[PDB]
């Protein structure tokens, strides 16, 4: 299959996240990596995929223009990181089709504005999504969690140690590429566990 | 009246689902098949028709264009699969009229975005629809049910065996067309039983 | 007054419903027939008028165009059927005035999309409508009733026999124009009774 | 002052409604009549004015065009009826300014669509309005009344006799100008009393 | 600092309200007067400022154009009345900046439509507003309070004497400009006390 | 790291707040200063960053144009003030990226209109915001708190002394730039504490 041969990281409960970052381009086939994510979601994930999307902004002095520059998919064992070109290449069809799948649910934190931007700027549609803060808010009856970011939401639901995460993110500008990737992988693993808890 | 002479499939409760997949051309008359679906819905389904819709995306490097390419209708005994052409032939107004029928209720999983895409891109309108996860959530007082995909919703409400489905969907990239049909038919049958349960 | 000289039908409680279908033309005066409907609604219907609208779709291979092709008005004792020309003739402003009336409440099943299409395509405005399912769902406290079509809703609220209706609709394509008229007459009658039971 | 010298009518509790119908035109000064309405609203009406608006529709074969053709203002002792020209004349400024007053509350029945049409087609804005069915729905906790027209709403709240009203409106097409006016005056008086009850 | 040397008025609780009405010209500096209002709001009003806005409508025979012509600001001790020119002079950005202040909360009666008109026609924006009837309704559990005008709301919550107000407003067409100011000042004082009551 | 070498201020609980105001230019690097804010937010602020935005309006005699002229970021220990040029310089995409961050939650008072103006005029998007009043209103069950400005909200939740703040703001026009900076610093500090008390 497709190997997630990038730098891995150990979480605070000893479990491991395998990573792969791909600079997608006209000739890159990401179907095997997406295939892996889905497989892991079906077997070991209760059909969830935690995701985040990252924007680049240009031409702010004129009329600011937002473009999706990368997306993260995290399952139980994997964290896939796709850096997207500008503009998209047609093979990214696969990504559009993936995001629209109902085989799974795309779990994210504060994603209201993202879903809008994805539609407006790229026509990317996510038919099966869950803004997990809203679900936590209802299920736990504690209204604050609707408004927390990834870390603080995870802290109110899981109370795991987040020392390493907090460390990397407090000095974000100085963090190496490997460090940035690690934080992303932790955030992924954290939200995966917030969902695991809310689904049972 | 009309013959569902494609590959049939056996569900985990030993009931048989008959199938038919059609490539709608300008000279194809789908009216006999919709009649069979309607007739089965009326006598054996409490006037529900399970549906899903499938999209192809084109031209994402410039301005993506979504387009409806297949629809699936399921009742207790039948699964109908229509593959649609680009563009539509004029005789597909039969399908438009069918979707707008108040004789039945079109039941689907996570269809909010679909309904929107059907209007914007085709002016297909569904006057009688039910997004089943919403109803289930409200009736069973378990909020998470609203944000689940087909399989995971079906699991929380029926607890039937889904090994076969999971097996097919986990390795979707390498599944035969016959396998994919089976998955679709199973999902149809599952959603139907979900509805059967919430309607009494 | 005007005469409902068309085919009458007996309901399952042995009460008679008179009908009239009209092919509205520029020379046709529908005012006596609306008058009769209105009159019956005031004396015998608690000022309810049950309605349904029917659409024709054209030009689906291109840019679909929806047009109101007929409307049905049902009271306790009458069912009026109006087939409408394309385009409307200018005397159809009598229908516009009627729909906008506050003398009555127009009762329909699953009419959200209908009201919208009536605005976009014709500027038909209904100032006093009731989506009967939404009201029943609230009153009876059975949330599913909001999403049922005409027959299935009537069943959960009335439990009258509906074998005749089911029989005609299950083989709709093979139903004579007289049979189809009867089915419409019955749905009207059924919905009138659902309203009757909820207004008291 | 301005005299309400038109045909008056006795209600079923013996009280009297004085009327005036005015065909407003470029040279008509309606300020004294509006002044009267406001006076009566301040003294004897708890600062309410019941209103209704009447539309004419044109050019239905083409693109239907709605224009406000008349408006009714009812207080405790008065029913003012203004027939508006096409187009408005500039002196109707006074009416725009009146409708925007916060000295009072404009009470009406099913006015959601009207407020939209008034804004879209004339830029008429009503800053202090009350759709009285919604208020009755809350206060009385009986959800049906949100959807009733003028008469049936009045019947559920007041249980006065409405024989004469029902009579006129069942044979609306045959009713003399005086008859039509009378119904309007009763509806006014009825809603005034529905409000009187809900305000104490 | 700035002198409110217009006609003062005595409220029914024997407290004195000082007034000032200004015709804002391009060389008028309203900043001293807004400062006084702010200062009084800060020390004696719990940072509330009562406001109303007044509209002139033009050109209704063709396409009506609404335009803001006066605003009133009230605190416990002061009532400021600004008559605005057509068009605005550039120095009215002071007023724009004042309305956008988060130092205070702009309290008004039935202001939903006003806020909309202020944006559409002037891009005046009020970041900190309170539609007081909404708050009152929610806090006192009496739904009707939301739909009341200034006087009638003030009556249901304070039960002060309003003979003077009622006297002036009932014969508004023949009230001196001094009388009209008094009415405005009184209304300001009433709404302020309404807020004083709901804020503790 | 970067130095907050501007005028520091003591709060009413004897804790020090360091400040820095910057006149952002094309050559100015704000990244160290945002880094410091972020760092303090992670270690000492439960990942909250308190913010306020300030607008300049132009061309009011014509068609008003709103432009973001400065923004304030407050944590437990720092207050950062950024005055922004017109137009923005292209390196301000660092501010865009920062506002869009999910590492933190941006906490503000009455920010509905702000978020909207930030979108219409600049495409500034805040993916993780909290309107603190709306949260407090829900938690404390005191509905008025949703509509209060910064000081009055802080008063109902904290009851700290605010004489210094009130003193500066009551004579705002006569306040030195140093005084105005202090007021902004305090509001930040106050809101931080309101958040602190609601997150625990």
Ranges of each domain in chain B: 1-200
Answer whether A touches C (≥3 Cβ pairs < 8 Å): no
Among residues B187, B195, B165, the alpha carbon closest in space to that of B52 is found at: B187
Minimum distance, in Å, between the CA of residue E66 and any CA atom of chain D: 8
Q: Where are the beta strands (DSSP E) in chain D?
A: 6-10, 16-23, 48-58, 65-74, 78-83, 105-108, 129-131
CA distance C122 to C78: 26
Residue that the structure tokens 């009757």 belong to: C196
Mutate to test the interface with D, among E53, E54, E55, E61 (most CBs of D within 10 A): E61
Q: Answer whether F177's CB lies under 8 Å from F42's CB.
A: no
> How far does the CA of residue F36 sit from the closest CA of chain A (Å)?
8
Which residues of E fall within a CB distance of 8 Å from F152? Answer: 46-47, 105
State whether F114 and E127 contact (CB < 8 Å).
Answer: yes
Q: Which residues of A are less than 8 Å from B61 in CB distance? A: 87-90, 92
Residues in chain A with CB shorter than 8 Å from the CB of F42 are 166, 169-170
Q: Do C43 and D166 touch (CB under 8 A)?
A: yes
Cα separations in angstroms, C183 against A115, C12, E13: 44, 13, 72
Cross-chain Cβ contact A109/F102 below 8 Å: yes
H helices of chain B, in order, are 31-44, 93-99, 112-122, 132-140, 150-158, 163-170, 177-199
Under DSSP, is residue D74 helix (H, G, I), strand (E, B) or coil?
strand
User: Is E66 within 8 Å of D105 when comparing Cβ atoms?
Assistant: no
Among E86, E71, E78, residue whose Cα is nearest residue E124: E71
Sheet architecture: strand order including F105-108: F9-10, F16-23, F78-83, F65-74, F48-58, F105-108, F129-131
Q: Does domain B1-200 have CATH number 3.40.1280.10?
A: no
**Residues B105, C148: C-beta atoms closer than 8 Å:** yes
CA distance F93 to chain E (A): 26
CA distance A136 to chain F (A): 15
The chain A residue lying nearest B60, using CA atoms, is A90
Which residues contact residue B182 at a Cβ distance below 8 angstroms, ignoring those fewer than 6 apart? B7, B9, B164, B168
- Contacts (Cβ under 8 Å, ≥6 apart) of F123: A57, A63, A64, A65, A66, F96
Which residue is listed with tokens 């609707």? A146
Compute the nearest-CA separation of A170 from chain B (Å).
Answer: 33
Structure tokens at A7: 């730098």
Q: What is the spatial distance between Cα A193 and Cα A191, in angstroms, rounded to a whole number?
A: 5
Q: How far apart are CA C162 and CA F168, in angstroms?
A: 78
Measure the CA–CA gap between E147 and C190, rounded to whole angstroms.
38
Report chain A residues whose CB lies below 8 A from the CB of B58. Answer: 93
Residues E60 and F162 sit within 8 Å (Cβ to Cβ): no
Report the C-alpha gap between F52 and F113 in whole angstroms.
12
The A105-108 sheet, strands edge to edge: A6-10, A16-23, A78-83, A65-74, A48-58, A105-108, A129-131
Q: Which residues of E touch F112 (CB under 8 A)?
A: 127
Q: Which of B51, B58, B60, B188 would you mutate first to test chain A, the one with the most A CBs within 10 A?
A: B60
Which residues have C-beta within 8 Å of that of residue D15, sequence separation ≥ 6? D189
D150 interaction partners in chain C (CB closer than 8 Å): 102-103
Whether the Cβ atoms of residue B107 and residue B47 lie closer than 8 Å to each other: no
Report yes or no: A35 and A152 within 8 Å, Cβ to Cβ.
no
F102 touches chain E (CB under 8 A): no
CA pair distance D38, D40, nearest whole angstrom: 5
Nearest to D38 by CA among D28, D29, D47, D51: D47
Q: Which of A68, A49, A77 is nearest to A123 (CA)?
A: A68
Contact B172 A35 (CB under 8 A): yes
Q: Is E199 on the interface with F (CB under 8 A)?
A: yes
CA distance B115 to chain A (A): 11
Of F59, F147, F172, the CB nearest to E38: F172
Of D83, D84, D78, D94, whose CA–CA distance to D4 is shortest? Answer: D78
Q: How far is CA B118 from CA B86, B122, F163, in A?
A: 15, 5, 60
Whole-number Cα distances in Å, F86 to F58, F67, F98:
12, 8, 20
Residue of A nearest to B63 (CA): A122
Nearest C-alpha in E relative to F174: E35
Query: Cβ of D116 under 8 Å from any chain E Cβ?
Result: no
Nearest-Cα residue of chain D relative to residue E109: D102
Give Cβ neighbours of residue E4 (< 8 Å, ≥ 6 apart): E18, E19, E20, E33, E36, E78, E80
Residue ranges of D 135-174 with Cβ closer than 8 A to chain E: 135, 138-139
Diameter of chain A by CA atoms? 49
Which tokens in the block code for residue D92?
């109707």
Of B143, B148, B166, the CB nearest to A139: B143
- Cα distance between residue D137 and residue F13, in whole Å: 51
As a whole number of angstroms, the longest Cα–Cα distance in chain C is 49
Pairing mode, strands F48-58 and F105-108: parallel
CB atoms within 10 A of CB E81: 23
Rounded to 5 degrees, φ, ψ at D111 are -120, 10
Q: Tell me which H or E stretch contains F78.
A: strand F78-83
CB contact under 8 A, C144 and B135: yes
In angstroms, the CA E69 to CA E62 distance is 21
Is B98 in contact with B106 (CB distance < 8 Å)? no
Q: Report d(CA D50, CA D163) in Å as an integer.
A: 22
- Residue A77's contacts (CB-CB under 8 Å, 6 or more residues apart) are A16, A17, A18, A40, A44
The answer to whether F39 contacts A166, with C-beta atoms less than 8 Å apart, is: no
User: CB-CB: which of B56, B147, B173 is closest to A31?
Assistant: B173
CB D42 within 8 A of CB D56: no
Test the F interface: residue of A54, A56, A68, A113 with most F CBs within 10 Å = A113
* Residue appearing with tokens 């008004």: E108
With contact defined as 3+ CB pairs under 8 Å, the chains touching D are C, E
Which of C:22-41 have CB within 8 Å of B? Answer: none
Which member of D55, D61, D149 has the closest CB to residue C87? D61
Do A167 and F43 touch, CB atoms closer than 8 A? no
Whether C47 sits inside 8 A of D117 (CB atoms) is: no
**Cβ within 8 Å of residue B109, ≥6 positions away:** A102, B52, B131, B132, B133, B148, B149, B150, B153, B191
Residue B140 has phi, psi (to 5 degrees) of -105, 0
User: In three state form, how does the secondary structure of E140-156 look?
Assistant: HCCHHHHHCCHHHHHHH
CB C69 within 8 Å of CB C83: yes
D182 touches chain C (CB under 8 A): no
Q: Please judge whether C147 and B128 are an interchain contact, meaning their C-beta atoms are less than 8 angstroms apart.
A: yes
Please state how this structure was obtained: X-ray
Q: Which residue among B96, B103, B105 places its CB closest to the CB of C147?
A: B105
Dump the DSSP string for chain C. Answer: -----S--EE-TTS-EEEEEEEE--TT---HHHHHHHHHHHHHHSTTEEEEEEEEEEE-TTTS-EEEEEEEEEE-SSEEEEEE--SS--GGGHHHHHHHT-SSSEEEESS-HHHHHHHHHHH----SSEEEHHHHHHHHH--GGGGG--HHHHHHHHH----HHHHHHHHTGGG--HHHHHHHHHHHHHHHHHHHHHHH-
Judging by DSSP bridges, how do beta strands B105-108 and B48-58 pair with one another? parallel
* HEC-encoded secondary structure of D19-70: EEEEECCCCCCCHHHHHHHHHHHHHHCCCEEEEEEEEEEECCCCCCEEEEEE
Q: Is E104 helix (H, G, I), strand (E, B) or coil?
A: coil
Nearest CB among E35, E43, E93 relative to F57 is that of: E93
Give which of F56, F64, F167 to mutate to test E binding, by max E Cβ within 10 Å.
F64
Of D39, D46, D130, the CB nearest to E171: D39
Breaks after residues in chain B, judged by C–N over 2.5 Å: none
Q: Are strands B78-83 and B65-74 parallel, antiparallel or unpaired?
A: antiparallel
Q: Do A64 and F138 touch (CB under 8 A)?
A: no
Of D42, D88, D129, the CB nearest to E170: D42
Contact partners for chain C, using 3 or more CB pairs closer than 8 A, are B, D
Q: How far apart are the first and last CA of chain E?
A: 30
Q: Does C184 touch chain B (CB under 8 A)?
A: no
């Amino acid at each position: 299959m497709a190997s997630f041969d990038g730098q891995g990281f150990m979480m605070v409960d000893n479990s491991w996240v395998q990573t792969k970052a791909i600079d997608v381009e006209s000739t890159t086939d990401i179907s095997p990596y997406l295939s892996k994510i889905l497989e892991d979601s079906v077997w070991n994930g209760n059909r969830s995929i935690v995701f985040d999307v990252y924007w680049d902004v240009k031409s702010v002095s004129t009329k600011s223009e937002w473009r999706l520059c990368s997306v993260k998919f995290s399952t139980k064992n994997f964290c896939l990181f796709l850096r997207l070109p500008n503009p998209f290449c047609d093979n990214l069809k696969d990504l559009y089709r993936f995001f629209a799948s109902k085989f799974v649910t795309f779990v994210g934190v504060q994603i209201q504005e993202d879903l809008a931007l994805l539609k407006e700027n790229h026509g990317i549609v996510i038919r099966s999504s869950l803004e997990i803060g809203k679900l936590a808010a209802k299920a736990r009856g504690t209204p604050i969690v609707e408004f927390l970011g990834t870390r603080e939401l995870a802290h109110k639901i899981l109370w795991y140690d987040m020392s390493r995460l907090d460390s990397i993110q407090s000095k974000w500008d100085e963090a190496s590429s490997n460090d940035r990737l690690e934080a992303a992988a932790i955030e992924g693993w954290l939200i995966f566990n917030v969902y695991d808890q809310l689904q049972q």
